[PDB]
Amino acid sequence: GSHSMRYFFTSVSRPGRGEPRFIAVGYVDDTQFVRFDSDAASQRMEPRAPWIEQEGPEYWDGETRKVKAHSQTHRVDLGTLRGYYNQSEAGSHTVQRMYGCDVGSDWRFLRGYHQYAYDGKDYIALKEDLRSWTAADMAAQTTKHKWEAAHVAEQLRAYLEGTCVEWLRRYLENGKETLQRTDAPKTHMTHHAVSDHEATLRCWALSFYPAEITLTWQRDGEDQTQDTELVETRPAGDGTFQKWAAVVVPSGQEQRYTCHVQHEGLPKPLTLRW
């Protein structure tokens, strides 16, 4: 199937409580592989998956150099945005950035991303064509005009279509045993009643990878959304994921309902009944 590489960056200013704190994390699909914490012991980019340890000192030096430079730029950006939005130096603020690339089943380029947020809302984003920008508000047009002049998109395009794709491929090959695995979900259904009148059926999906999954309820072979509850896919803590979907049914009608599970690790979709 398809794959992605993504980096996620967060900086928070806290006036009167020191200089900003910066956190960087890198993922391939749903697996974290690197981290940097500006207040942590090492002051280096750190490994978080076994296969990235295959990379040598030039890599760890280079990635450390780049992430530290990124942290300093966010410190500059926090000041820049305070100015753009005419804000005082008393409040706490947050800058976020994400970038990365998607490839299809043939490992060829599908899509690239490069975008920023300020205080929980969009600020600026690279469009799908990798040639133009979407500015979220009037303030962000200043950044847009600046980046168009300095040809930022062209440089970013080269990374997203080349370097990003090639290194995603390298990681997938180097960590084949884990990154290219598909762990099908362990599935079961439970039944619970507090009254004589209704019962909750809960369809479970456990120990699956990647996180991508679809859980649907049907009644008499028709999709059923009313009286259902679906929880957010959640991490087990061991590199696998969990999810449940539940439906409240009238007593005596449990057998009308089926739970349908779709996952890459399943050769065909699964059907569960009470």
């Binding site: 890198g26 780049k66 990124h70 730029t73 500059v76 950006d77 970038y99 990374y159 990003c164 290194w167």
Partner: peptide
């Protein structure tokens, strides 16, 4: 692998 340039708002 991270992008190899300095992008500033």
């Amino acid at each position: 692998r991270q992008i190899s340039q300095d992008v500033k708002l």
